[PDB]
Amino acid sequence: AWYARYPHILEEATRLPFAYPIGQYYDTGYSVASATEWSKYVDTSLTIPGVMCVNFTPTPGESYNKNSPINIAAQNVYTYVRHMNSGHANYEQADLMMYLLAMDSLYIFHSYVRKILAISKLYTPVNKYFPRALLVALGVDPEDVFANQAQWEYFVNMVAYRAGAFAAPASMTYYERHAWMSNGLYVDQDVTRAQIYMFKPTMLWKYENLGTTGTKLVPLMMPKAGDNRKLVDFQVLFNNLVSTMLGDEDFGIMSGDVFKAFGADGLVKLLAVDSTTMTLPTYDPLILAQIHSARAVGAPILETSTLTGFPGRQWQITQNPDVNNGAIIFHPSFGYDGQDHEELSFRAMCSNMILNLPGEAHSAEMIIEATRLATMFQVKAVPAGDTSKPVLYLPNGFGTEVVNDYTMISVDKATPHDLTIHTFFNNILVPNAKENYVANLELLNNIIQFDWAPQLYLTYGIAQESFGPFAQLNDWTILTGETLARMHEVCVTSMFDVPQ
Amino acid sequence: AWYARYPHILEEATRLPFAYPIGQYYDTGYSVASATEWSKYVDTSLTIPGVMCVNFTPTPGESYNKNSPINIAAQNVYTYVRHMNSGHANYEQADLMMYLLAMDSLYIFHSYVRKILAISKLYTPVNKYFPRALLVALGVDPEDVFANQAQWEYFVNMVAYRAGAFAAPASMTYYERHAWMSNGLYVDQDVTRAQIYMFKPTMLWKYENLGTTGTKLVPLMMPKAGDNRKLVDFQVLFNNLVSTMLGDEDFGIMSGDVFKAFGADGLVKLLAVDSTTMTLPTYDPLILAQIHSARAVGAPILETSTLTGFPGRQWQITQNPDVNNGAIIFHPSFGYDGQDHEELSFRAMCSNMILNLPGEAHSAEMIIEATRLATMFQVKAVPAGDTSKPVLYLPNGFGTEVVNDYTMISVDKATPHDLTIHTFFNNILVPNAKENYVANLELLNNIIQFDWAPQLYLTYGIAQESFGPFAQLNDWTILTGETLARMHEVCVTSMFDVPQ
Amino acid sequence: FTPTPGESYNKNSPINIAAQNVYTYVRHMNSGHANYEQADLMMYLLAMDSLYIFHS
């Protein structure tokens, strides 16, 4: 060949600088020097996004009866605590189970602040997003972690010490699943300049035992991305979390009874951190499998949230013993977008989802673990009133965690190329504006930069027509709501299961 | 360990049919029962495209004086023919070189009709685009191949017999590249229900021999995908391809000189076909690398094409002994969209290209072979007149072939779900209309269904702003005009050569 | 019951694919008469099916 005869000309001809370090703006330049008269018609910008954050919410699953897996697990752990290990008989099954859920929220908070501490020591020349973009996506000021890192470390250690006052079973996979999910960095590819997936809890459950009418886990809001929160705000959040937890007699005898039934080696163990413990991003395909099938349900509903025609639709877990035979009722109203309007794009999520999977042959565990974060709407919630500004949807069942939002961190194409935060569901609405089509195209390109990005459903407001899954398909199926509800029931039963 | 002690429920809960055969419309249905009142706001339509045809054009490599690599190769092959072996003095070097260029067009046409005949025997139940969609994308009537298979077979055999009468050197790797490109299907993911890439000539060079002005090569059009031409149109094309070529007495004199110079074994031989010669799709990442880094230049300019301010910009490989010292002359003008107006989206190609490659370490052969189909504009061609409706762009030296446009085949949105043909460049213009945005969105989704799809530069007419490369970048670099011209000179010289 | 060839609104239906395959086997491999298309042969085969259903 000619290439074998003259390899020197081929070598000197094709020496190009590869491996551009992502994290800053790049300008391609002009091939035509007279193209400056067409200013916006030539796109010389080139931005590579680096961080996608999955804003998740811990849930016990769908529950409207006593036949829910949460109530079955409550009855089983109550039998193991009292009827086999001599309990105190000052509480029911549901009080113990809501106490266990409060433990889950505590361990999620500890893994969250441990990830916040461990992220800030990551520095590399090939990625300029490390570690400021991850701290921006977590809603924490990076200067407050640069300046007082030792205070952050000792606060994390003190959280791990104070969380050991109560007890929780180690063999329950719910705790270790939430702690592993909330404390990981997951690259979308096995390359040195990959993109970071993340899991930030926006919801934490706060114990609210007031009155005789039963306990309740009220919502507690976590810092959203772009809010520069310091260590004092996280300490205030932690003290608000254990305000009604420590100093409670019922919680004290519950911790004593769990410490009696399960041994000292049978309880969970929060690991101590120090100055040499840092985490690196790992490649997890099973994380990408459930990230791909993740379906957003929108921002949660609080007591302060105003809804026209929807009163009392807050995301609370109730423990009223006078109604429903004292069941742990938790079924929320989805589709709320954070404010009081119609949110036309959420109608695109009313079709049956497409379960996409890598490879050709799929095991049962792969299909079950790929549908952990999926949620399909089933029936519209009937409003109590003649006028209704939003539209809410009741699901047919969800897993141990739902997805509310997503967060994109990428460099801006305009001066001075700082980080931009883009919050979006799977559904993206593009209304009548000349500045919204190019922004939506840039958001689409930034989404498809990631490998297993969730399947979007873009609604165009000027054509009154939405679009299906905007993702590349390899081996897919159509999932009905009944089969996904069955898989969610299996997942919630297996996660809350404890061995006796 | 709930999955271990209850494996039957885990096995039964995840029995899903995953191998969905592409090639038909799929209605996912409504997950919410009352979502049928939202009309097009719930998109329950899912289509997977199957055919991407890359429409190319053979070129000598932008000759503009005697110092071009094609003229140097003409001098080298003329010294090899007439100085090393006792030849004739009736023909010059440029006549022999353009005879060799016309032999490439004849071999491309033979491989074209051979692929038309060999495609129609492809059938698999998991891909319903076989073989009707490939025959639609190749521009033939699919029913005419099935109804007249015996007349189609001997036509290809007679084309091979009447094109094998002349000689062309097999040591020259121009023919062994073009014939290998023009036949054979190329899957994009090496799976069973993969997507097929193709290569079809948009045009071919028909030999016409004039008097003292020269033996200039002329354009000859080819049927596009929405034509459904029968066998007699291809017979007419083959008849006027060699109408003034087989009727020339001096043609065989220089044809036999190649035979006696290069021997009887170092010649290009055409493979005869029978009823069992069936081609199969193969996986080649070398083809996908140059498919991914490909840039469209537009439709060729003909003598019948009307251009305001561009009277003599027709694509012709001229050779006049009177002017330019008897050199082969070929400098086409790109940027022609087929109509007599300026294509607004062609301004987006004035930025520097992005060479994206898989993996981390790239050899020099991979870099020089990944830039074969790319073509970058350098400077606008000066119009001859006070007004000009289109805008044409002169290249900085193109490679051995140029991509005109692309043809994409997919099933229809509505009844009866027949094949639809989409013709688009690398630049897609979305004008301000009611229904163009969702058509552009489904075009984008169908393009990103393909794995190594070319990078699209979408220009929006409402915002008067275009966007950069719409492709997933993995390991990329910015290519300037000078480096790509340096690569293209090497890639032109490496094909037009003889190692003796 | 009613004998049917299946759903067919395109040329990608299995009835048309079987018609093309049996037409190729009849003509292009076994020297057919070229006075009819694939579909005429396939409708003739369906008429044979109705005849054998009547006999049974």
Short mmCIF file of C-alpha atoms in Angstrom, two decimals, chain B residues 52-469:
data_model
loop_
_atom_site.label_atom_id
_atom_site.label_comp_id
_atom_site.label_asym_id
_atom_site.label_seq_id
_atom_site.Cartn_x
_atom_site.Cartn_y
_atom_site.Cartn_z
CA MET B 52 -29.57 5.57 5.64
CA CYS B 53 -28.17 5.98 2.13
CA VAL B 54 -25.06 8.14 1.75
CA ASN B 55 -25.23 9.70 -1.71
CA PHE B 56 -21.67 10.23 -2.97
CA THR B 57 -19.92 11.45 -6.11
CA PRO B 58 -16.52 10.28 -7.44
CA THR B 59 -13.98 13.07 -7.88
CA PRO B 60 -10.32 13.33 -8.94
CA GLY B 61 -9.48 15.65 -6.03
CA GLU B 62 -9.76 19.35 -7.02
CA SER B 63 -7.33 19.80 -9.89
CA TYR B 64 -6.58 23.44 -10.71
CA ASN B 65 -3.17 23.39 -12.45
CA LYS B 66 -0.51 20.96 -13.66
CA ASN B 67 0.82 20.51 -10.11
CA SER B 68 -2.30 18.68 -8.90
CA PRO B 69 -1.80 15.09 -7.64
CA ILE B 70 -4.09 13.71 -10.37
CA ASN B 71 -1.87 15.24 -13.08
CA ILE B 72 1.24 13.89 -11.32
CA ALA B 73 -0.41 10.46 -11.28
CA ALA B 74 -1.29 10.92 -14.96
CA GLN B 75 2.37 11.59 -15.75
CA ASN B 76 3.46 8.60 -13.64
CA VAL B 77 1.01 6.18 -15.28
CA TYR B 78 1.87 7.54 -18.75
CA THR B 79 5.59 6.97 -18.13
CA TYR B 80 4.72 3.50 -16.82
CA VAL B 81 2.68 2.67 -19.93
CA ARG B 82 4.59 4.16 -22.87
CA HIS B 83 8.21 4.41 -21.67
CA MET B 84 8.52 1.00 -19.97
CA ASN B 85 6.52 -0.72 -22.74
CA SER B 86 6.40 0.14 -26.44
CA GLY B 87 3.06 1.92 -26.77
CA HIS B 88 1.30 4.28 -29.16
CA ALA B 89 1.65 8.00 -29.79
CA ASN B 90 -2.01 8.63 -30.69
CA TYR B 91 -2.99 9.60 -27.13
CA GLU B 92 -1.54 11.89 -24.48
CA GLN B 93 -1.27 11.45 -20.71
CA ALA B 94 -4.52 13.27 -19.91
CA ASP B 95 -6.56 11.17 -22.35
CA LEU B 96 -5.32 7.99 -20.63
CA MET B 97 -6.01 9.42 -17.16
CA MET B 98 -9.54 10.51 -18.02
CA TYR B 99 -10.12 7.12 -19.67
CA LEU B 100 -9.12 5.62 -16.31
CA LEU B 101 -11.56 8.02 -14.63
CA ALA B 102 -14.36 6.87 -16.96
CA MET B 103 -13.53 3.24 -16.12
CA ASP B 104 -14.25 4.10 -12.48
CA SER B 105 -17.70 5.38 -13.49
CA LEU B 106 -18.37 2.18 -15.45
CA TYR B 107 -17.29 0.02 -12.50
CA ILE B 108 -19.41 2.09 -10.10
CA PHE B 109 -22.44 1.63 -12.38
CA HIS B 110 -21.82 -2.13 -12.61
CA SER B 111 -21.55 -2.41 -8.82
CA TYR B 112 -24.67 -0.22 -8.53
CA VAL B 113 -26.83 -2.53 -10.66
CA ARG B 114 -25.19 -5.58 -9.04
CA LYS B 115 -26.20 -4.30 -5.60
CA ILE B 116 -29.70 -3.58 -6.93
CA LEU B 117 -29.96 -7.21 -8.07
CA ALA B 118 -28.34 -8.71 -4.96
CA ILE B 119 -30.30 -6.63 -2.43
CA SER B 120 -33.71 -8.01 -3.46
CA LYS B 121 -32.98 -11.54 -2.15
CA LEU B 122 -32.53 -10.30 1.45
CA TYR B 123 -35.20 -11.36 3.93
CA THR B 124 -35.34 -11.72 7.71
CA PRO B 125 -38.45 -11.68 9.93
CA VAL B 126 -36.84 -9.34 12.49
CA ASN B 127 -36.25 -6.59 9.88
CA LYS B 128 -39.24 -5.72 7.70
CA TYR B 129 -37.28 -3.13 5.71
CA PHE B 130 -35.70 -6.03 3.78
CA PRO B 131 -35.66 -5.80 0.81
CA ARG B 132 -38.27 -3.23 -0.24
CA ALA B 133 -36.85 -0.21 1.61
CA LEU B 134 -33.32 -0.68 0.24
CA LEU B 135 -34.70 -0.90 -3.30
CA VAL B 136 -36.78 2.22 -2.61
CA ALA B 137 -33.69 4.08 -1.35
CA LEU B 138 -31.69 2.92 -4.38
CA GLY B 139 -34.32 4.49 -6.64
CA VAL B 140 -35.65 1.41 -8.43
CA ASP B 141 -39.16 0.06 -8.53
CA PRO B 142 -39.19 -2.89 -6.07
CA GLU B 143 -41.90 -4.68 -8.07
CA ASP B 144 -39.91 -4.41 -11.31
CA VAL B 145 -37.00 -6.40 -9.85
CA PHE B 146 -39.35 -9.17 -8.69
CA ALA B 147 -41.44 -9.31 -11.87
CA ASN B 148 -38.44 -9.14 -14.26
CA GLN B 149 -35.68 -10.91 -12.32
CA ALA B 150 -34.50 -12.95 -15.32
CA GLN B 151 -34.25 -9.82 -17.47
CA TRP B 152 -32.48 -7.97 -14.64
CA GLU B 153 -29.90 -10.73 -14.10
CA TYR B 154 -28.66 -10.96 -17.69
CA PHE B 155 -28.61 -7.15 -17.89
CA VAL B 156 -26.08 -7.09 -15.03
CA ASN B 157 -24.18 -9.98 -16.65
CA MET B 158 -24.07 -8.11 -19.98
CA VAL B 159 -22.97 -4.92 -18.20
CA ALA B 160 -20.12 -6.90 -16.61
CA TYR B 161 -19.26 -8.51 -19.96
CA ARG B 162 -19.19 -5.21 -21.88
CA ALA B 163 -17.30 -3.41 -19.10
CA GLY B 164 -14.72 -6.18 -18.73
CA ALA B 165 -13.62 -5.73 -22.34
CA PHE B 166 -11.42 -2.79 -21.34
CA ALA B 167 -8.65 -2.68 -18.75
CA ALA B 168 -7.95 -0.72 -15.59
CA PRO B 169 -5.03 -1.27 -13.18
CA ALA B 170 -5.84 -3.11 -9.96
CA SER B 171 -2.64 -1.75 -8.39
CA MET B 172 -4.40 1.62 -8.39
CA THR B 173 -6.49 1.53 -5.20
CA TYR B 174 -9.04 4.02 -6.57
CA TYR B 175 -11.15 1.20 -8.05
CA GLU B 176 -10.71 -1.13 -5.07
CA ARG B 177 -11.95 1.63 -2.76
CA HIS B 178 -14.89 2.77 -4.89
CA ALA B 179 -16.11 -0.75 -5.72
CA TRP B 180 -15.81 -1.85 -2.08
CA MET B 181 -17.78 1.23 -1.04
CA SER B 182 -20.49 0.94 -3.71
CA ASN B 183 -21.56 -2.64 -2.89
CA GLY B 184 -22.16 -4.21 0.49
CA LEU B 185 -24.39 -3.23 3.41
CA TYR B 186 -22.98 -1.87 6.66
CA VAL B 187 -24.77 -2.38 9.98
CA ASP B 188 -24.37 0.31 12.65
CA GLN B 189 -24.35 -1.74 15.86
CA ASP B 190 -23.55 -5.40 14.88
CA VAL B 191 -26.95 -6.63 16.11
CA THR B 192 -29.72 -8.55 14.38
CA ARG B 193 -32.19 -5.64 14.10
CA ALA B 194 -29.51 -3.13 13.17
CA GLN B 195 -29.66 -0.15 10.81
CA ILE B 196 -28.27 -0.37 7.29
CA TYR B 197 -25.87 2.15 5.78
CA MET B 198 -25.52 2.36 2.00
CA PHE B 199 -23.63 4.21 -0.72
CA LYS B 200 -25.30 5.28 -3.96
CA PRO B 201 -23.80 7.42 -6.75
CA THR B 202 -25.74 10.64 -7.23
CA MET B 203 -23.95 11.16 -10.55
CA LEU B 204 -21.43 9.53 -12.86
CA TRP B 205 -18.97 10.85 -15.43
CA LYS B 206 -20.04 10.07 -19.00
CA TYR B 207 -17.25 10.14 -21.57
CA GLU B 208 -17.79 12.40 -24.56
CA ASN B 209 -15.00 12.95 -27.08
CA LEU B 210 -15.06 16.29 -28.89
CA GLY B 211 -12.54 17.56 -31.44
CA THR B 212 -9.51 19.75 -30.77
CA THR B 213 -11.15 21.32 -27.69
CA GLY B 214 -10.69 18.08 -25.73
CA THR B 215 -12.27 14.90 -24.39
CA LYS B 216 -14.09 16.54 -21.45
CA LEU B 217 -16.07 14.42 -18.98
CA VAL B 218 -19.75 15.33 -18.64
CA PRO B 219 -22.34 14.93 -15.84
CA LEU B 220 -24.85 12.08 -15.92
CA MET B 221 -27.66 12.00 -13.37
CA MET B 222 -28.85 8.94 -11.41
CA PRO B 223 -32.36 8.05 -10.15
CA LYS B 224 -33.14 9.41 -6.70
CA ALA B 225 -35.11 7.42 -4.13
CA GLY B 226 -38.53 8.79 -5.04
CA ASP B 227 -38.35 7.76 -8.70
CA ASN B 228 -39.25 4.02 -8.95
CA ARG B 229 -37.45 3.64 -12.28
CA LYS B 230 -37.85 0.38 -14.18
CA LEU B 231 -35.26 -1.75 -15.98
CA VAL B 232 -35.49 0.20 -19.25
CA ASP B 233 -34.34 3.42 -17.54
CA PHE B 234 -31.18 1.67 -16.33
CA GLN B 235 -30.76 0.21 -19.82
CA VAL B 236 -31.03 3.74 -21.25
CA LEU B 237 -28.46 4.94 -18.69
CA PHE B 238 -26.05 2.14 -19.61
CA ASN B 239 -26.67 2.74 -23.33
CA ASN B 240 -25.81 6.43 -23.22
CA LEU B 241 -23.00 5.76 -20.74
CA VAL B 242 -21.06 3.95 -23.50
CA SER B 243 -22.79 5.46 -26.56
CA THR B 244 -19.73 7.46 -27.64
CA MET B 245 -17.32 5.16 -25.76
CA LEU B 246 -17.86 1.76 -27.40
CA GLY B 247 -18.29 3.62 -30.71
CA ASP B 248 -14.77 5.09 -30.59
CA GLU B 249 -12.01 3.36 -32.54
CA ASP B 250 -9.17 4.99 -30.58
CA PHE B 251 -10.60 3.82 -27.24
CA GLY B 252 -9.53 0.19 -27.68
CA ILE B 253 -6.01 1.22 -28.68
CA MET B 254 -5.38 2.74 -25.26
CA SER B 255 -7.50 0.02 -23.62
CA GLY B 256 -5.15 -2.70 -24.90
CA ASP B 257 -2.11 -0.68 -23.87
CA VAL B 258 -3.21 -0.96 -20.22
CA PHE B 259 -3.63 -4.71 -20.81
CA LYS B 260 -0.11 -5.18 -22.17
CA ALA B 261 1.41 -2.83 -19.57
CA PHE B 262 -0.21 -4.08 -16.35
CA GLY B 263 -0.55 -7.69 -17.49
CA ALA B 264 -3.60 -9.93 -17.43
CA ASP B 265 -3.54 -10.51 -13.65
CA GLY B 266 -3.09 -6.96 -12.34
CA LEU B 267 -6.41 -5.71 -13.70
CA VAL B 268 -9.77 -4.88 -12.15
CA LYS B 269 -12.14 -7.82 -12.61
CA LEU B 270 -15.91 -7.67 -12.19
CA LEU B 271 -17.63 -10.46 -10.27
CA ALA B 272 -20.30 -12.21 -12.31
CA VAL B 273 -23.60 -13.01 -10.60
CA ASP B 274 -26.03 -15.91 -10.61
CA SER B 275 -29.15 -16.90 -8.66
CA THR B 276 -27.21 -17.65 -5.45
CA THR B 277 -24.96 -14.56 -5.14
CA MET B 278 -26.50 -12.75 -2.17
CA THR B 279 -24.77 -9.98 -0.24
CA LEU B 280 -25.03 -9.75 3.54
CA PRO B 281 -24.65 -6.76 5.88
CA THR B 282 -21.32 -6.65 7.70
CA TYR B 283 -19.92 -4.62 10.59
CA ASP B 284 -17.02 -2.32 9.67
CA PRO B 285 -16.05 0.52 12.05
CA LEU B 286 -13.77 1.95 9.35
CA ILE B 287 -16.84 2.69 7.21
CA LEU B 288 -18.71 4.16 10.19
CA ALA B 289 -15.78 6.41 11.13
CA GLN B 290 -15.80 8.14 7.74
CA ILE B 291 -19.61 8.10 7.67
CA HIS B 292 -19.68 9.95 11.01
CA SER B 293 -17.18 12.60 9.88
CA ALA B 294 -18.90 13.42 6.59
CA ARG B 295 -20.10 16.82 5.37
CA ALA B 296 -22.65 17.39 2.62
CA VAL B 297 -21.83 19.78 -0.22
CA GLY B 298 -25.17 19.81 -2.06
CA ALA B 299 -26.49 18.72 -5.42
CA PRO B 300 -24.19 18.88 -8.48
CA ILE B 301 -24.45 21.81 -10.89
CA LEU B 302 -25.47 20.83 -14.42
CA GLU B 303 -25.74 22.72 -17.70
CA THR B 304 -29.54 22.74 -17.34
CA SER B 305 -29.28 24.17 -13.80
CA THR B 306 -30.06 27.89 -13.71
CA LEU B 307 -27.95 30.03 -11.37
CA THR B 308 -28.10 33.80 -10.97
CA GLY B 309 -24.59 35.22 -11.14
CA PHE B 310 -23.01 31.78 -11.74
CA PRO B 311 -23.13 31.10 -15.49
CA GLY B 312 -20.34 28.56 -15.94
CA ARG B 313 -20.09 26.72 -12.62
CA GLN B 314 -21.08 23.32 -14.02
CA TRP B 315 -19.29 20.25 -12.67
CA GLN B 316 -17.06 19.03 -15.49
CA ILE B 317 -13.63 17.41 -15.62
CA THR B 318 -12.37 19.40 -18.60
CA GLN B 319 -9.13 18.94 -20.51
CA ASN B 320 -8.18 21.52 -23.13
CA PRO B 321 -4.72 21.53 -24.76
CA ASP B 322 -5.18 25.21 -25.65
CA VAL B 323 -5.59 26.59 -22.11
CA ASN B 324 -3.89 25.82 -18.76
CA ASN B 325 -1.01 23.97 -20.52
CA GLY B 326 -3.13 20.95 -21.41
CA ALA B 327 -3.90 20.06 -17.80
CA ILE B 328 -6.91 18.31 -16.35
CA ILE B 329 -9.08 21.04 -14.81
CA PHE B 330 -11.83 20.41 -12.24
CA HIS B 331 -12.81 23.04 -9.63
CA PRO B 332 -16.50 22.67 -8.78
CA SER B 333 -18.53 25.12 -6.71
CA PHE B 334 -20.46 23.66 -3.78
CA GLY B 335 -23.37 25.07 -1.78
CA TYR B 336 -26.03 24.34 -4.42
CA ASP B 337 -29.33 23.08 -3.00
CA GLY B 338 -31.01 22.35 -6.35
CA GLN B 339 -33.05 25.57 -6.60
CA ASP B 340 -32.19 29.11 -7.71
CA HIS B 341 -32.08 30.65 -4.25
CA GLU B 342 -29.66 30.83 -1.33
CA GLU B 343 -29.96 27.94 1.12
CA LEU B 344 -29.98 29.62 4.52
CA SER B 345 -28.76 26.56 6.43
CA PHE B 346 -25.54 26.36 4.37
CA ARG B 347 -24.13 29.26 6.41
CA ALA B 348 -23.82 26.83 9.35
CA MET B 349 -21.15 24.83 7.48
CA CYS B 350 -18.76 27.82 7.61
CA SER B 351 -17.48 26.76 11.04
CA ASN B 352 -14.57 24.36 11.49
CA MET B 353 -15.47 20.68 11.58
CA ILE B 354 -15.20 18.38 14.59
CA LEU B 355 -13.43 15.06 14.02
CA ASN B 356 -14.95 12.65 16.54
CA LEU B 357 -13.45 9.18 16.92
CA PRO B 358 -14.17 6.24 19.22
CA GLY B 359 -11.70 5.00 21.79
CA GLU B 360 -8.71 6.83 23.21
CA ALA B 361 -5.68 5.99 21.03
CA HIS B 362 -6.13 6.51 17.29
CA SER B 363 -3.65 5.30 14.69
CA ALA B 364 -2.63 7.47 11.74
CA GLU B 365 -4.51 5.18 9.33
CA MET B 366 -7.74 5.67 11.29
CA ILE B 367 -7.33 9.46 11.28
CA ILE B 368 -6.53 9.62 7.56
CA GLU B 369 -9.41 7.25 6.72
CA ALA B 370 -11.96 8.98 8.97
CA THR B 371 -11.66 12.24 6.98
CA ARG B 372 -12.24 10.87 3.47
CA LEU B 373 -15.87 11.96 3.11
CA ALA B 374 -15.49 15.31 4.89
CA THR B 375 -15.42 18.55 2.89
CA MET B 376 -15.02 22.04 4.34
CA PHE B 377 -15.84 25.37 2.73
CA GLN B 378 -13.09 27.97 2.49
CA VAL B 379 -14.19 31.09 0.59
CA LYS B 380 -17.37 32.14 -1.22
CA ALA B 381 -17.21 32.08 -5.00
CA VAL B 382 -17.34 35.57 -6.51
CA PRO B 383 -20.52 36.09 -8.58
CA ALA B 384 -20.20 37.48 -12.10
CA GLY B 385 -22.87 40.16 -12.05
CA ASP B 386 -24.63 42.83 -10.01
CA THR B 387 -27.01 40.30 -8.43
CA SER B 388 -26.90 36.65 -7.37
CA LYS B 389 -29.74 34.62 -5.85
CA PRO B 390 -27.77 31.57 -4.58
CA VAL B 391 -24.52 31.61 -2.62
CA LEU B 392 -21.86 29.09 -3.66
CA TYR B 393 -18.84 28.10 -1.58
CA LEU B 394 -15.45 27.01 -2.97
CA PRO B 395 -13.70 24.21 -1.06
CA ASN B 396 -10.15 24.15 0.25
CA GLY B 397 -9.42 20.91 -1.59
CA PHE B 398 -11.75 17.94 -1.25
CA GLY B 399 -11.01 14.24 -1.08
CA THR B 400 -11.53 11.38 -3.50
CA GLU B 401 -15.32 11.66 -3.12
CA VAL B 402 -17.89 14.17 -1.90
CA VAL B 403 -21.26 13.58 -0.23
CA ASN B 404 -24.13 15.42 -1.89
CA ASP B 405 -26.99 14.57 0.50
CA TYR B 406 -28.58 11.69 2.42
CA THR B 407 -31.72 9.58 2.05
CA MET B 408 -33.51 8.21 5.11
CA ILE B 409 -36.23 5.54 4.98
CA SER B 410 -38.72 4.96 7.80
CA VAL B 411 -42.31 3.87 8.28
CA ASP B 412 -45.10 6.43 8.07
CA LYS B 413 -46.84 8.09 11.00
CA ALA B 414 -50.40 7.34 9.85
CA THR B 415 -52.31 4.73 7.82
CA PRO B 416 -51.19 2.61 5.92
CA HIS B 417 -47.61 2.97 7.31
CA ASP B 418 -45.78 2.86 3.99
CA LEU B 419 -42.19 3.97 3.42
CA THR B 420 -41.29 7.66 3.59
CA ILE B 421 -38.23 9.26 1.99
CA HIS B 422 -36.39 12.14 3.68
CA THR B 423 -33.68 14.00 1.76
CA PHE B 424 -31.43 16.26 3.83
CA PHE B 425 -27.89 17.61 3.90
CA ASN B 426 -25.68 17.84 6.97
CA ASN B 427 -27.40 21.22 7.45
CA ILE B 428 -31.16 21.19 8.05
CA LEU B 429 -33.25 24.36 7.72
CA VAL B 430 -36.35 24.64 9.90
CA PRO B 431 -38.49 27.56 8.64
CA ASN B 432 -41.16 29.26 10.72
CA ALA B 433 -44.26 27.15 10.04
CA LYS B 434 -46.91 25.44 12.14
CA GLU B 435 -45.92 21.79 11.62
CA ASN B 436 -42.20 21.99 10.80
CA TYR B 437 -40.91 21.79 14.39
CA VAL B 438 -42.35 18.36 15.26
CA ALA B 439 -41.20 17.10 11.83
CA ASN B 440 -37.69 18.34 12.63
CA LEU B 441 -37.90 16.69 16.06
CA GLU B 442 -38.89 13.30 14.64
CA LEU B 443 -36.19 13.74 11.98
CA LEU B 444 -33.67 14.34 14.79
CA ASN B 445 -34.87 11.27 16.70
CA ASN B 446 -34.71 9.09 13.58
CA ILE B 447 -31.19 10.34 12.80
CA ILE B 448 -29.96 9.67 16.35
CA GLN B 449 -31.45 6.18 16.03
CA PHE B 450 -28.42 5.58 13.80
CA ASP B 451 -25.23 5.03 15.78
CA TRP B 452 -22.53 6.89 13.83
CA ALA B 453 -24.88 9.37 12.21
CA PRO B 454 -23.35 12.53 10.68
CA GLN B 455 -23.20 15.67 12.80
CA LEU B 456 -26.14 17.93 11.97
CA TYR B 457 -26.06 21.74 11.94
CA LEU B 458 -29.68 22.81 12.34
CA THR B 459 -30.55 26.40 11.44
CA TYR B 460 -33.77 27.89 12.83
CA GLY B 461 -35.45 30.54 10.69
CA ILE B 462 -37.46 32.07 13.53
CA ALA B 463 -34.43 32.84 15.73
CA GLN B 464 -32.10 33.46 12.73
CA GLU B 465 -29.55 31.32 14.56
CA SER B 466 -27.98 27.93 13.84
CA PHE B 467 -26.58 25.28 16.16
CA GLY B 468 -23.32 23.34 16.12
CA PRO B 469 -22.65 19.60 15.88
#
